[PDB]
Amino acid sequence: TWLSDFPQAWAETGGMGLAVRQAPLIIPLKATSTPVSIKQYPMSQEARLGIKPHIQRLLDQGILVPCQSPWNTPLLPVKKPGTNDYRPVQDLAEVNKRVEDIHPTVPNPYNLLSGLPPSHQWYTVLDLKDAFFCLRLHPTSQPLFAFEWRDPEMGISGQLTWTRLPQGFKNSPTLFDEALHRDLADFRIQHPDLILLQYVDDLLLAATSELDCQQGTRALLQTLGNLGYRASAKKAQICQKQVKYLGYLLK
Numbered sequence: 001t002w003l004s005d006f007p008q009a010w011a012e013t014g015g016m017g018l019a020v021r022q023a024p025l026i027i028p029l030k031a032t033s034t035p036v037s038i039k040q041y042p043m044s045q046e047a048r049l050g051i052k053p054h055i056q057r058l059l060d061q062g063i064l065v066p067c068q069s070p071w072n073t074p075l076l077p078v079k080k081p082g083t084n085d086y087r088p089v090q091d092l093a094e095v096n097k098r099v100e101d102i103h104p105t106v107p108n109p110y111n112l113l114s115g116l117p118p119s120h121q122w123y124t125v126l127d128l129k130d131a132f133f134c135l136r137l138h139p140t141s142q143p144l145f146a147f148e149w150r151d152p153e154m155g156i157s158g159q160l161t162w163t164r165l166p167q168g169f170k171n172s173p174t175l176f177d178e179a180l181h182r183d184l185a186d187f188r189i190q191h192p193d194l195i196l197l198q199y200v201d202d203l204l205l206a207a208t209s210e211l212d213c214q215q216g217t218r219a220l221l222q223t224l225g226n227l228g229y230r231a232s233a234k235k236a237q238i239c240q241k242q243v244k245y246l247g248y249l250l251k
Contacts, residue, residue: 003233005218008225010233011129016061017230022179024138025165033098035070038091040148047077048151050086055149055160063133067161069143071095089168095144096170104174109246112197113204120195120206122213123243123250124220126231128180131201132172134229135165135179145169173200183227191216197245203231204245213239 007013058064073095077086128134137145146161165172177200188196194216195206205220207213217238224231237243242251 002217002221002236002238006221006225009221009229009231011230012233014225014230016063016130017128017134018136018228019134019179019183020226020228021183022135024136025141025175026138027141027144027171028100029098030100036094036098037070037072038074038094039072041074041076043077046084047079047086050079050084051075051077051088052151052154054088059160063162063164064160065142065163066156067143067146067159069146069159069161071144071146072159073145073147075147075149090145090147090166092145092166092168092170096168099144099169099171102171102174104177106174106177106199109199112199113245113248113250116195116197116206120208121241122207122210122239123237123241123245124205124213124217124239125237125243125245126203126205126220126224127235128201128203128224129230129232131176131180131229132167132169133164135176137163137165139163176200180229183229184223187220187223191219196220199246202246204243207239210239 003010003013011017055064074091076089076091078089079086142161142163145166146159148158149160150157165175177198180198180201184196184198193208193212197204197206205213205216207216221231242249244250
């Protein structure tokens, strides 16, 4: 129904996204910042083989590429509770510390919803999958996020780094919010009878009736697909009068 019509708007059917209108991002440093190289902490064999699959996937998607840089931060295998699944988690504290700050133009998780008029009772909530990875990193800033990766009988031994905005980077939330705000501006002007709330990668569309919500959602998904974003079809809440958004429950 809603999936078949917009295959490029869903993560499950469109694959990894890529914001086609966003130029590669350059990351400004603080004036006195200098490169930091924290060597990779030793890792249990179970851990390394545990994250290999995630690292390999990332490399297949071209999100990770080999490199060599004077920057380097530790990669930590984070054991998922209950299961024997390890997720690669990088500690960018030392890098975040050296990057120039950005003043979040982000409204607020509360004052946001409080603006919603009671006149719009129909909602559609969407969360974008791997939002940060949809924004590319300019090759000049890529070296900042480098880390070590080695695996004997695998294929490589050295440093890897990201070609997309990484997790753990203090400025990703804001950078993605601003980018998505730029990409969805026209949508707003083209649909003044709809209310569009957006906080980083979580979206809420409000209409004055089930019909407008239906048509508004179709237009939104269409727009997200064209742009290269991907929402979670699994967690989507389409044209409902009661939905949960940002932890809050609406009725």
